[PDB]
Amino acid sequence: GIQISGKGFMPISIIEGDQHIKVIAWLPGVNKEDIILNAVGDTLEIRAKRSPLMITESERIIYSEIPEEEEIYRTIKLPATVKEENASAKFENGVLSVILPKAESSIKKGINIE
Amino acid sequence: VAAGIQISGKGFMPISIIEGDQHIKVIAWLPGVNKEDIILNAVGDTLEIRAKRSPLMITESERIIYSEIPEEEEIYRTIKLPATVKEENASAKFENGVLSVILPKAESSIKKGINIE
Amino acid sequence: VAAGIQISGKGFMPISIIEGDQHIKVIAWLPGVNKEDIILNAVGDTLEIRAKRSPLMITESERIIYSEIPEEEEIYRTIKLPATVKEENASAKFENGVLSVILPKAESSIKKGINIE
Amino acid sequence: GIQISGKGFMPISIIEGDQHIKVIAWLPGVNKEDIILNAVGDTLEIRAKRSPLMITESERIIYSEIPEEEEIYRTIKLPATVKEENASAKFENGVLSVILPKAESSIKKGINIE
Amino acid sequence: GIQISGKGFMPISIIEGDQHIKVIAWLPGVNKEDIILNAVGDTLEIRAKRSPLMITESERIIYSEIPEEEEIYRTIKLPATVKEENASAKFENGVLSVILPKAESSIKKGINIE
Amino acid sequence: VAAGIQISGKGFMPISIIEGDQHIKVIAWLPGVNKEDIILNAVGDTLEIRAKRSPLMITESERIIYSEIPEEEEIYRTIKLPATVKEENASAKFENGVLSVILPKAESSIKKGINIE
Amino acid sequence: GIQISGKGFMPISIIEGDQHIKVIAWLPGVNKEDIILNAVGDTLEIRAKRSPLMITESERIIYSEIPEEEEIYRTIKLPATVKEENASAKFENGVLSVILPKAESSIKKGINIE
């Protein structure tokens, strides 16, 4: 049971494990220090600003499939309650990878089959 | 300043083309691609960008419950440019999943000004 | 007696939810699934059923000429239940491709009657 | 060339080999002794009754995706004539697997290519 | 924030105190032993059956404003979480009075004004 | 001269059926199929053609930029014929991706003329 | 950037390498000597004639999914300029395979990434 809200281009994958949730976000063209990343309860926020293409006076853009929206974000409701203090994140090749350890109250315990 | 361009290829790869007096710049989005998995070639008025993107790597315990992210492993674009370039002098950077190619125009494609006596 | 429930997951797995005063019973159809390939977990008001179904196994001489049977190898459901259960006391049977889970309600989810003086 | 008729929920696969036909049927919730299984010529009949969910007086059904149809069957026309006396069947995990040896008159013989 | 569902005639008052909630219900014509009364979390259930007017063969009803519905109930969502084990109830003159002590987690603590 | 025929199977395999007085000829298109990967069987009034087609074989440097050509690896047709044949006497050629099967009619399927006294 | 024109049934694949282009064409029922194959610049021509099914007077066609069009061709614009003199071709199992070496002017040279 997930829920997604926000502005701009930011494709996302959500990966569930037994004791953690992983969120993968595409942020090409974004600098690492321009990413704001926070979480509480079952909710993760990704905030980013993407600097526009920088042309000279001689240069002109003759073609562009690339979005110009400078400010982008996603608020993501997760299927579990996480523990924010223990989360971590990498940012390589324009991809953000957030690891959110599940709270104990959200960690399912096994039931045996007879 | 929309010139005469042509685009062909496979997979997700947004592109910008920037024209200057003496060069052309191509910008390509390649998130999730490693630098050494990019093949980059050019001749005449044509530029080729070839890349492979490794899929999301999950454990046995992990499962994907949601994904907006394309799974196509192999992607490419062949791009016809409005000028003839000189390949030997081209260069490229790859930062934050963005490839930036600089292609100097061939001398026979640069505007030489004509002096008015 | 339709209470507040919520269902998420992948693949074919018909489900019934049965509420009693002190327990909840979940019934799941898992034909073609081996018992040891079922993962079954719960906490709070949530139950997870994870299973993998091995595909039809044909020889080289055999060919499939007709099939209404789903080929999805990996299936799951996450199920929000109308009560908080106590996982440690749950139990389950698997007969004829049907999984039956019994989840005792947590004491704070059972109706305690109030005596009228 | 196959043909299928019957009542109720019973997904089916048909597998052809050189000397036999295999029929796979999903019968979750059905007891083995409540399956009737017969065949003649090119036709196989699968008859089954599925006992409904058994609740107590305290228990109530608040949700159900599970079909309540008590009696179910399929009559299946097969692409070959089988020999019934030699057929066999297993029933594991709610799946019925019928093996029907082909009659000799239905067993194709090879033609060589020059 | 309250919510009410159920069948039949049963006027209700809800009274909030700092440490308890009182529910008042009109149940004229109902015997005390035919009242079912339970609670959990923020929810109270009142179940009752009202025996119909009992006439002889000579007697006939020529006028009646009185509801004939034999079985009646209310499910009541309360603005606080209660502690069921400590609740109590009286039934006098056809009026049920339920006292539901609030759980500690639902007991508001004071904030001082400077 | 459209007789009583019936066709079932998987994949691309155009077919012609030709009837003579004493034989039936079946023509099947199997481009890209090797001869030894064709399985060919018959009994009564029924002919089976089974084939596997190896996919286009590219190098690592090569890429497919356009393809109208089906990728289905395994293909078959079961064909009901308007006469009973005698399998033991059948024959077949495979040239230029075309299979040609000759199936002599069983004596009980050939028109015996009746002499008018 | 490719372009295809012509008459009749002839499924085609185009394969690009660094120094060559491969064209694959389906020509079942065509004899090798009835294939005309030429090229210049960025253009390849495939011309073929397919002899119709040859029946006796006793024989009759009762069913046919097979196209009767006797003469077929494709003109194919290729994404590179080829060198015709160096091309080659095989014809096995009704499949034509043309190998067209790229001209030097069409051979892309590498650009290094810093």
Side-chain angles (χ1 to χ4, degrees):
Chain A
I2 57 197
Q3 196 170 338
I4 292 179
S5 100
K7 169 185 182 270
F9 181 77
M10 198 194 311
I12 268 164
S13 295
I14 304 168
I15 292 149
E16 177 161 17
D18 294 332
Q19 298 194 45
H20 73 270
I21 295 192
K22 197 194 272 200
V23 175
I24 308 300
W26 277 8
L27 298 173
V30 171
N31 280 51
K32 177 195 293 187
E33 65 259 46
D34 299 338
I35 295 170
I36 304 178
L37 188 63
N38 36 96
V40 86
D42 61 340
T43 228
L44 175 76
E45 196 185 42
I46 301 168
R47 273 155 69 205
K49 53 198 310 164
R50 184 183 288 120
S51 322
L53 310 179
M54 190 190 47
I55 67 182
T56 77
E57 264 281 338
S58 12
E59 287 174 333
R60 49 240 126 116
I61 305 178
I62 71 187
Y63 186 79
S64 184
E65 295 170 61
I66 290 171
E68 359 197 302
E69 348 121 325
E70 298 215 1
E71 211 92 25
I72 60 176
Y73 51 79
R74 281 290 192 284
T75 330
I76 306 169
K77 185 174 186 110
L78 296 91
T81 287
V82 304
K83 41 189 311 144
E84 353 82 43
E85 56 195 4
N86 284 354
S88 61
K90 293 174 190 175
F91 186 59
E92 310 174 358
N93 307 305
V95 176
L96 180 67
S97 300
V98 195
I99 297 185
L100 306 131
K102 286 176 173 179
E104 259 291 329
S105 69
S106 263
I107 297 178
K108 310 197 203 57
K109 283 73 191 188
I111 299 163
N112 287 317
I113 303 169
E114 75 153 289
Chain B
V1 213
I5 58 196
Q6 195 172 339
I7 294 178
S8 104
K10 169 188 182 268
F12 180 79
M13 196 195 311
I15 268 163
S16 295
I17 304 172
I18 291 148
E19 179 161 18
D21 293 331
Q22 300 196 45
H23 73 270
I24 296 191
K25 195 194 273 202
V26 177
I27 308 301
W29 275 9
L30 296 173
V33 170
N34 281 49
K35 178 193 290 186
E36 67 259 45
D37 297 340
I38 296 172
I39 303 178
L40 189 60
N41 283 275
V43 85
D45 61 339
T46 235
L47 174 76
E48 198 183 41
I49 301 169
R50 273 154 70 202
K52 53 200 308 163
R53 183 183 286 121
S54 320
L56 311 179
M57 191 190 45
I58 68 181
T59 79
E60 264 282 337
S61 14
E62 288 173 335
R63 49 246 125 114
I64 305 179
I65 71 186
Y66 186 79
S67 185
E68 297 169 57
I69 291 171
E71 1 194 301
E72 346 120 326
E73 298 214 2
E74 211 92 26
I75 61 179
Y76 51 78
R77 282 286 193 286
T78 329
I79 303 169
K80 187 172 185 111
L81 295 92
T84 286
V85 303
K86 38 192 312 147
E87 351 86 40
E88 66 203 358
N89 286 351
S91 61
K93 292 176 190 175
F94 186 58
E95 310 174 1
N96 305 310
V98 177
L99 178 68
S100 304
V101 196
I102 297 180
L103 303 127
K105 287 176 171 178
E107 227 76 50
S108 41
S109 263
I110 307 184
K111 315 190 165 198
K112 305 297 175 35
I114 305 158
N115 284 84
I116 305 161
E117 146 197 350
Chain C
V1 213
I5 58 196
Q6 195 172 339
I7 294 178
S8 104
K10 169 188 182 268
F12 180 79
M13 196 195 311
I15 268 163
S16 295
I17 304 172
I18 291 148
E19 179 161 18
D21 293 331
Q22 300 196 45
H23 73 270
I24 296 191
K25 195 194 273 202
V26 177
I27 308 301
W29 275 9
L30 296 173
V33 170
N34 281 49
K35 178 193 290 186
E36 67 259 45
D37 297 340
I38 296 172
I39 303 178
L40 189 60
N41 283 275
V43 85
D45 61 339
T46 235
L47 174 76
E48 198 183 41
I49 301 169
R50 273 154 70 202
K52 53 200 308 163
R53 183 183 286 121
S54 320
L56 311 179
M57 191 190 45
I58 68 181
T59 79
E60 264 282 337
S61 14
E62 288 173 335
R63 49 246 125 114
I64 305 179
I65 71 186
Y66 186 79
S67 185
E68 297 169 57
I69 291 171
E71 1 194 301
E72 346 120 326
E73 298 214 2
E74 211 92 26
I75 61 179
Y76 51 78
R77 282 286 193 286
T78 329
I79 303 169
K80 187 172 185 111
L81 295 92
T84 286
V85 303
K86 38 192 312 147
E87 351 86 40
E88 66 203 358
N89 286 351
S91 61
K93 292 176 190 175
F94 186 58
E95 310 174 1
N96 305 310
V98 177
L99 178 68
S100 304
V101 196
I102 297 180
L103 303 127
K105 287 176 171 178
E107 227 76 50
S108 41
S109 263
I110 307 184
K111 315 190 165 198
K112 305 297 175 35
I114 305 158
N115 284 84
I116 305 161
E117 146 197 350
Chain D
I2 57 197
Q3 196 170 338
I4 292 179
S5 100
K7 169 185 182 270
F9 181 77
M10 198 194 311
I12 268 164
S13 295
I14 304 168
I15 292 149
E16 177 161 17
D18 294 332
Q19 298 194 45
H20 73 270
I21 295 192
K22 197 194 272 200
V23 175
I24 308 300
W26 277 8
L27 298 173
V30 171
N31 280 51
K32 177 195 293 187
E33 65 259 46
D34 299 338
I35 295 170
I36 304 178
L37 188 63
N38 36 96
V40 86
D42 61 340
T43 228
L44 175 76
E45 196 185 42
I46 301 168
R47 273 155 69 205
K49 53 198 310 164
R50 184 183 288 120
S51 322
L53 310 179
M54 190 190 47
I55 67 182
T56 77
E57 264 281 338
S58 12
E59 287 174 333
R60 49 240 126 116
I61 305 178
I62 71 187
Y63 186 79
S64 184
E65 295 170 61
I66 290 171
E68 359 197 302
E69 348 121 325
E70 298 215 1
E71 211 92 25
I72 60 176
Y73 51 79
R74 281 290 192 284
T75 330
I76 306 169
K77 185 174 186 110
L78 296 91
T81 287
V82 304
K83 41 189 311 144
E84 353 82 43
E85 56 195 4
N86 284 354
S88 61
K90 293 174 190 175
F91 186 59
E92 310 174 358
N93 307 305
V95 176
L96 180 67
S97 300
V98 195
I99 297 185
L100 306 131
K102 286 176 173 179
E104 259 291 329
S105 69
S106 263
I107 297 178
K108 310 197 203 57
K109 283 73 191 188
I111 299 163
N112 287 317
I113 303 169
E114 75 153 289
Chain E
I2 57 197
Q3 196 170 338
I4 292 179
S5 100
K7 169 185 182 270
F9 181 77
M10 198 194 311
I12 268 164
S13 295
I14 304 168
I15 292 149
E16 177 161 17
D18 294 332
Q19 298 194 45
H20 73 270
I21 295 192
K22 197 194 272 200
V23 175
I24 308 300
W26 277 8
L27 298 173
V30 171
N31 280 51
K32 177 195 293 187
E33 65 259 46
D34 299 338
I35 295 170
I36 304 178
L37 188 63
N38 36 96
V40 86
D42 61 340
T43 228
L44 175 76
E45 196 185 42
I46 301 168
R47 273 155 69 205
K49 53 198 310 164
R50 184 183 288 120
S51 322
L53 310 179
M54 190 190 47
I55 67 182
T56 77
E57 264 281 338
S58 12
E59 287 174 333
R60 49 240 126 116
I61 305 178
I62 71 187
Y63 186 79
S64 184
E65 295 170 61
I66 290 171
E68 359 197 302
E69 348 121 325
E70 298 215 1
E71 211 92 25
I72 60 176
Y73 51 79
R74 281 290 192 284
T75 330
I76 306 169
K77 185 174 186 110
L78 296 91
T81 287
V82 304
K83 41 189 311 144
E84 353 82 43
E85 56 195 4
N86 284 354
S88 61
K90 293 174 190 175
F91 186 59
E92 310 174 358
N93 307 305
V95 176
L96 180 67
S97 300
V98 195
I99 297 185
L100 306 131
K102 286 176 173 179
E104 259 291 329
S105 69
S106 263
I107 297 178
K108 310 197 203 57
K109 283 73 191 188
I111 299 163
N112 287 317
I113 303 169
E114 75 153 289
Chain F
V1 213
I5 58 196
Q6 195 172 339
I7 294 178
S8 104
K10 169 188 182 268
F12 180 79
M13 196 195 311
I15 268 163
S16 295
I17 304 172
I18 291 148
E19 179 161 18
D21 293 331
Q22 300 196 45
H23 73 270
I24 296 191
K25 195 194 273 202
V26 177
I27 308 301
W29 275 9
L30 296 173
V33 170
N34 281 49
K35 178 193 290 186
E36 67 259 45
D37 297 340
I38 296 172
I39 303 178
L40 189 60
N41 283 275
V43 85
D45 61 339
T46 235
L47 174 76
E48 198 183 41
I49 301 169
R50 273 154 70 202
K52 53 200 308 163
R53 183 183 286 121
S54 320
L56 311 179
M57 191 190 45
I58 68 181
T59 79
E60 264 282 337
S61 14
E62 288 173 335
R63 49 246 125 114
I64 305 179
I65 71 186
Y66 186 79
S67 185
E68 297 169 57
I69 291 171
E71 1 194 301
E72 346 120 326
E73 298 214 2
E74 211 92 26
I75 61 179
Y76 51 78
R77 282 286 193 286
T78 329
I79 303 169
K80 187 172 185 111
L81 295 92
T84 286
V85 303
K86 38 192 312 147
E87 351 86 40
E88 66 203 358
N89 286 351
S91 61
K93 292 176 190 175
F94 186 58
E95 310 174 1
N96 305 310
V98 177
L99 178 68
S100 304
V101 196
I102 297 180
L103 303 127
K105 287 176 171 178
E107 227 76 50
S108 41
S109 263
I110 307 184
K111 315 190 165 198
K112 305 297 175 35
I114 305 158
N115 284 84
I116 305 161
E117 146 197 350
Chain G
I2 57 197
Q3 196 170 338
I4 292 179
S5 100
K7 169 185 182 270
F9 181 77
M10 198 194 311
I12 268 164
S13 295
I14 304 168
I15 292 149
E16 177 161 17
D18 294 332
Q19 298 194 45
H20 73 270
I21 295 192
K22 197 194 272 200
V23 175
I24 308 300
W26 277 8
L27 298 173
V30 171
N31 280 51
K32 177 195 293 187
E33 65 259 46
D34 299 338
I35 295 170
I36 304 178
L37 188 63
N38 36 96
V40 86
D42 61 340
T43 228
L44 175 76
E45 196 185 42
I46 301 168
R47 273 155 69 205
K49 53 198 310 164
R50 184 183 288 120
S51 322
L53 310 179
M54 190 190 47
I55 67 182
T56 77
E57 264 281 338
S58 12
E59 287 174 333
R60 49 240 126 116
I61 305 178
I62 71 187
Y63 186 79
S64 184
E65 295 170 61
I66 290 171
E68 359 197 302
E69 348 121 325
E70 298 215 1
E71 211 92 25
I72 60 176
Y73 51 79
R74 281 290 192 284
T75 330
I76 306 169
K77 185 174 186 110
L78 296 91
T81 287
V82 304
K83 41 189 311 144
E84 353 82 43
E85 56 195 4
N86 284 354
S88 61
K90 293 174 190 175
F91 186 59
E92 310 174 358
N93 307 305
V95 176
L96 180 67
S97 300
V98 195
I99 297 185
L100 306 131
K102 286 176 173 179
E104 259 291 329
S105 69
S106 263
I107 297 178
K108 310 197 203 57
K109 283 73 191 188
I111 299 163
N112 287 317
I113 303 169
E114 75 153 289

